[PDB]
Design an enzyme around this catalytic site. Structure first.
Site, mmCIF file in Angstrom:
data_model
loop_
_atom_site.group_PDB
_atom_site.id
_atom_site.type_symbol
_atom_site.label_atom_id
_atom_site.label_comp_id
_atom_site.label_asym_id
_atom_site.label_seq_id
_atom_site.Cartn_x
_atom_site.Cartn_y
_atom_site.Cartn_z
ATOM 1 N N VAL A 13 14.335 -6.604 -6.148
ATOM 2 C CA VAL A 13 14.941 -6.102 -4.928
ATOM 3 C C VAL A 13 14.751 -4.588 -4.840
ATOM 4 O O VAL A 13 14.880 -3.862 -5.836
ATOM 5 C CB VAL A 13 16.447 -6.478 -4.766
ATOM 6 C CG1 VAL A 13 17.288 -5.911 -5.884
ATOM 7 C CG2 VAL A 13 16.987 -6.010 -3.412
ATOM 8 N N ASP A 14 14.419 -4.154 -3.631
ATOM 9 C CA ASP A 14 14.144 -2.754 -3.287
ATOM 10 C C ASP A 14 12.958 -2.077 -3.987
ATOM 11 O O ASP A 14 12.838 -0.882 -3.937
ATOM 12 C CB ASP A 14 15.417 -1.898 -3.412
ATOM 13 C CG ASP A 14 16.500 -2.298 -2.424
ATOM 14 O OD1 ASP A 14 16.203 -2.819 -1.313
ATOM 15 O OD2 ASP A 14 17.673 -2.065 -2.770
ATOM 16 N N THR A 18 8.942 -5.565 1.344
ATOM 17 C CA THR A 18 8.995 -5.650 2.801
ATOM 18 C C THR A 18 8.215 -4.481 3.414
ATOM 19 O O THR A 18 7.409 -4.679 4.340
ATOM 20 C CB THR A 18 10.443 -5.694 3.311
ATOM 21 O OG1 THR A 18 11.080 -6.887 2.808
ATOM 22 C CG2 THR A 18 10.494 -5.693 4.846
ATOM 23 N N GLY A 36 -7.390 -7.632 19.727
ATOM 24 C CA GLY A 36 -6.274 -7.684 18.776
ATOM 25 C C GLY A 36 -6.447 -8.717 17.671
ATOM 26 O O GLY A 36 -7.439 -9.451 17.615
ATOM 27 N N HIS A 79 11.274 -14.560 -4.035
ATOM 28 C CA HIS A 79 11.071 -15.663 -4.989
ATOM 29 C C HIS A 79 11.549 -17.036 -4.511
ATOM 30 O O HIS A 79 10.961 -18.042 -4.890
ATOM 31 C CB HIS A 79 11.695 -15.284 -6.326
ATOM 32 C CG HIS A 79 11.157 -13.994 -6.882
ATOM 33 N ND1 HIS A 79 11.809 -13.267 -7.858
ATOM 34 C CD2 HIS A 79 10.039 -13.286 -6.573
ATOM 35 C CE1 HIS A 79 11.107 -12.185 -8.140
ATOM 36 N NE2 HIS A 79 10.044 -12.161 -7.355
ATOM 37 N N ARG A 133 6.910 9.049 -4.594
ATOM 38 C CA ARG A 133 8.174 9.559 -5.158
ATOM 39 C C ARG A 133 8.016 10.294 -6.498
ATOM 40 O O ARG A 133 9.001 10.789 -7.036
ATOM 41 C CB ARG A 133 9.190 8.429 -5.343
ATOM 42 C CG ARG A 133 9.816 7.986 -4.032
ATOM 43 C CD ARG A 133 10.749 6.821 -4.230
ATOM 44 N NE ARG A 133 11.879 7.200 -5.063
ATOM 45 C CZ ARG A 133 12.922 7.919 -4.654
ATOM 46 N NH1 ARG A 133 13.007 8.356 -3.396
ATOM 47 N NH2 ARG A 133 13.890 8.207 -5.518
ATOM 48 N N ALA A 198 3.688 2.081 -0.254
ATOM 49 C CA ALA A 198 3.988 1.357 0.988
ATOM 50 C C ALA A 198 4.437 2.315 2.097
ATOM 51 O O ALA A 198 4.263 2.010 3.280
ATOM 52 C CB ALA A 198 5.053 0.324 0.729
#
Ligand code: GDP
Length: 598
Positions: A13-14, A18, A36, A79, A133, A198
């Site tokens: 998660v995180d 996404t 397109g 998952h 980061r 991302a």
């Protein structure tokens, strides 16, 4: 001819699953071109020409000539989705991206992903995400990794190298050799690690080029399109205004058409219905697509994400197969195929094993497979809330092996009837909504239950204990003596004989009490009131501030050191060493023999 590899995105998660899917989509859409990109339900395509274009700045190092028509990315990450993207005996996904946050490294769900990937034999690469980061990073948006890394300061590149190695280390440790993608020669032998952002798009070009190359090189047979009726899997069942209950599916072989008879797995058995409509999102170029808009199509081909309207789909469950049938005769055959597939996942037996309940077929399958991997027998596996019957099935198991006599409930309610029975039966219900956590919680309980059973054997014995009589806490001087003590090491229990620091016998523990209650045991650091039955008279045989010991029989000391050594506390062993030495200096016969024996 070949069809699109189906790509799924995994990771903790995180860590950015996404964001990465969205960035890939945007990059594809921006890179296109003239007309397109064909839109799908729950999925985004990146066409062959768009990948080649995105890969152009790599021309010299990593060339890319494509024979796949494109890649289909499943747009729901994670998952549970991956587990529902299933067919009989394997995954419908052809490749995975395992996202790891480069700044955090592996987390618990990263290991879940690796298990799911080996279990279902899905090939993958690692996307080492959030490189932007790294302290001192100076972004070059959308640039290949190989270009932007050369435009960073030496310290920034040092950190990246350190963080990549953290991932490499964990992978080698797990039995899965992996390297920075640039250093790999044989992509059969080593998993690729692609550093990416991302957020900025850095490294997306190599991500796509590596995906494309690995899929088209090794998966040609799996990717071959055969003309025939659709085979697919249902990912989601839901309401849609103007169409009733729809299913959102992935078609992995053949063609599905408006008016096709379909056979789909449902809670009560295989449902036979007919397609009224196949829905896809409207083209993005279309001016009416500012409105969130769908269009009907005549047909979709593998690989496709598609929404299907047909009556009678209310009882469909996520992870169910869906087959087009050319005739009623073919549908009758496909009904048997469906029912046989469903029976492998939802079953009940007379075996001594755990009771597994889950909410979808995928997670039920993955839960059962994870237990099987660990050697845990499964009595039954089914969909829905934990019932009284489930608890009673686990009670049958419990009578034979309590360590197996449990209900493992994944994201389903527990009925009050079941709560009541579990209490009466001594059956534990485990509830969780992440598979690895359910499994870990069960395993931890099993470890503590097995330890409890060993401790029963140890508590057959008088254990080492050492305690000081507290100045100011002499409640009663004799018959019985009652004194406040602090336990300095090991353990004291009612019934234990006690002795002084010279090994003289004083009596036996009648009782051990809190300010609140009577205790079965007191351990290091407890301050408790100990009642001592025997000749003991405080002021005479022992004083405030004196240290007392349990009088461990020689045979008991032998068994502790030769059968329970790993189980007792370090402090418990320290005290036994004191006791053995008190016994040695007193010239105790049985201790002398046991010590020689040791
Ligand atoms: N700085 C930075 N943030 C990111 C990156 N990828 C994702 N994030 C952020 O990390 C958070 C989690 O992202 P998300 O895609 O929801 O992770 P998921 O839970 O794995 O799907 C969000 O705030 C994202 O904006 C990246 O490459 N760089």
């Amino acid at each position: 001819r070949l069809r699109q590899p189906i790509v799924v995105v995994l990771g903790h998660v995180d860590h950015g699953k996404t964001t990465l899917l969205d960035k890939i989509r945007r990059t594809a859409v921006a890179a296109k071109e003239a007309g397109g990109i064909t839109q799908h339900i729950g999925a985004s395509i990146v066409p062959a020409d768009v990948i080649e274009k995105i890969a152009e700045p790599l021309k010299k190092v990593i060339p890319v000539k494509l024979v796949i028509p494109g890649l289909l990315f499943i747009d729901t990450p994670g998952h549970e989705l991956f587990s529902n993207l299933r067919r009989r005996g394997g995954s419908v996904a052809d490749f995975a991206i395992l996202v790891v946050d480069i700044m955090e490294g592996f987390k618990p769900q990263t290991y879940e992903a690796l298990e799911l990937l080996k279990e279902r034999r899905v090939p993958f690469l690692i996307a080492a995400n959030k490189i932007d980061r790294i302290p001192g990073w100076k972004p070059n948006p959308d640039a290949p990794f190989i270009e932007t890394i050369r435009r960073q300061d030496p310290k920034v590149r040092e950190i990246l190298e350190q963080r990549v190695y953290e991932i490499v280390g964990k992978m080698y440790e797990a039995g899965l050799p992996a390297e920075l993608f640039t250093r790999i020669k044989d992509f059969r032998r080593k998993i690729a690690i692609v550093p990416v952002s991302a957020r900025t798009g850095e490294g997306i070009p190599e991500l796509l080029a590596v995906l494309a190359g690995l899929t088209q090189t090794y998966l040609k047979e799996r990717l071959r399109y055969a003309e025939g009726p659709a085979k697919g899997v249902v990912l989601e069942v839901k309401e849609m205004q103007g169409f009733g209950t729809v299913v959102d599916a992935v078609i992995y072989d053949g063609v599905l058409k408006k008016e096709d008879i379909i056979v789909v797995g449902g809670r009560e058995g295989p449902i036979v219905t007919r397609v009224r409509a196949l829905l896809m999102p409207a083209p993005l170029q279309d001016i009416r697509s500012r409105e969130a808009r769908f269009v009907q199509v005549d047909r979709v081909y593998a690989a496709a994400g598609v929404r299907i309207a047909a009556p009678g789909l209310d009882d469909v469950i996520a992870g169910s197969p869906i087959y087009a049938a050319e005739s009623e005769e073919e549908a009758r055959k496909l009904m048997e195929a469906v029912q046989r597939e469903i029976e492998e996942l939802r079953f009940r037996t007379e075996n001594i094993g755990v009771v597994v309940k889950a909410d979808t077929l995928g997670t039920l399958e993955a839960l059962v497979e994870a237990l099987r991997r660990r050697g845990v027998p499964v009595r039954l596996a089914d969909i829905g809330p934990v019932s009284r019957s489930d608890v009673l099935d686990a009670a049958v198991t419990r009578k034979i092996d309590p360590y197996l006599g449990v209900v493992l409930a994944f994201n389903v309610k527990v009925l009050p009837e079941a709560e009541e029975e579990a209490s009466r039966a001594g059956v534990k219900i485990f509830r969780e909504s992440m598979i690895y956590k359910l499994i870990e919680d069960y395993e931890e309980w099993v470890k503590k239950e097995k330890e409890a059973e060993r401790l029963k054997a140890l508590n057959s014995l008088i254990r080492p204990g050492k305690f000081r009589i507290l100045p100011g806490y002499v409640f009663r001087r004799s018959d019985p003596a009652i004194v406040g003590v602090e336990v300095l090491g090991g353990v004291i229990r009612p019934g234990y004989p006690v002795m002084d620091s010279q090994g003289r016998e004083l009596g036996r523990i009648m009782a051990i009490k809190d300010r609140d209650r009577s205790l079965e045991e007191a351990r290091l650091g407890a301050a408790v009131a100990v009642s001592i039955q025997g000749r003991i008279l405080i002021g005479r045989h022992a004083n405030e501030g004196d240290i007392l010991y349990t009088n461990v029989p020689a045979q008991h000391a032998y068994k502790i050191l030769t059968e329970f050594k790993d189980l007792v506390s370090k402090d418990e062993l320290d005290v036994l060493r004191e006791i053995a030495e008190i016994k040695r200096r007193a010239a105790d016969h049985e201790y002398n023999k046991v010590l020689l024996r040791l």
